Amino acid sequence: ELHTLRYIRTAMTDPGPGLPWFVDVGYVDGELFMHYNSTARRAVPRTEWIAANTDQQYWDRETQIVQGSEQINRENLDILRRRYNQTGGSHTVQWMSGCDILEDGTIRGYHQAAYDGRDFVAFDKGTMTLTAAVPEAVPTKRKWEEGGYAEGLKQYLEETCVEWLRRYVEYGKAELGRRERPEVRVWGKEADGILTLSCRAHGFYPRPIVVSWLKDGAVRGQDAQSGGIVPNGDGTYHTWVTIDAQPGDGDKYQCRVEHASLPQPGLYSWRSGGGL
Amino acid sequence: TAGQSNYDRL
Amino acid sequence: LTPKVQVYSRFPASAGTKNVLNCFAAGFHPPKISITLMKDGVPMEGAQYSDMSFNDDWTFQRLVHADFTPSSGSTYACKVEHETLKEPQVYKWDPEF
């Protein structure tokens, strides 16, 4: 029942070649649905469930507010460079806003910024004030206390996004709820008297997966090294786990893959061999 | 849905 | 911040069949990164950039994917150029690993 919404923004000085300087990306449970760039200057859908449940009037209203966000982040790069006293080079302005609907039903809304990959300003709901993490983020707090954006932002993070996220979950209930089975392949490589056994899971959904190596039926979590849950170009995910072994012990090892698509954890060997 | 452009001002 | 790169394929590698070569880099800063997929040292055709996001810890991430057909004798790799690496980091793609 844990459903998330996140709108990530990036304003750049050096994109660099061909790439756009401004980019706004939206997410529903970690999946891309909203796309924007400074070259095209249009908020367009990415998933089939969002486009089939929204009109062009919604996307036209979403474009103009992000176009305004583009211009606001354009001057932000120039304003922040004066406070730090910098001529130019590699400078970036990051922003991540959204709300989380927890299992119990508690609303967890976040709104925070960063300059040069370091925490700048973060909004708190319990205090209803914008917290400044860096001494150069103090004039930002002065602008927020004068304007009074605090009440308007709180009614957005607790109501506006929360009401829309409930609809987004219902719009893509068939897409998010769908489970994709992974294609498992068990490999091995010989180097300096050490056999490195590899296990790769191809195109699985959702993102959570536990891929562990086994020796004689017993799990060996410490000896196994994972590469992480890396994403594919179509929306699916990939994972790579390797373990060191004695040459001639390869078949004693088994790859355990426990995913939402599998009712029981899948056990795959090199000679079996793998998923096929 | 994203709110007002003013919340991104620094 | 130095990038954490991993080279992998979409579908399990099979000779004379169409596949997608993925190169994902994460945990880096500044966001400017030169990720190039190459066949025998020569850059690959149809390299598409789709990912331009950052994690909860503000660290950037990028995925570069291109349509290809795996052939025996041809070595596939991913060249990553960053201002924190000094020398370009190249990661080899193995079809049977």
TrEMBL record, chain A:
Residues annotated as domain Ig-like: 182-261
Annotated disulfide bonds: C99-C161, C199-C255
BP GO annotations: antigen processing and presentation of peptide antigen via MHC class I
Keyword set, alphabetical order: Disulfide bond, Glycoprotein, Immunity, Membrane, MHC I, Signal, Transmembrane, Transmembrane helix
Membrane topology field: Single-pass type I membrane protein
A Gene Ontology cellular-component term: MHC class I protein complex
Family statement drawn from the similarity comment of this UniProt entry: Belongs to the MHC class I family.
Name this polypeptide is given: MHC class I alpha chain 2
Included range, full protein: 22 to 291 of 355
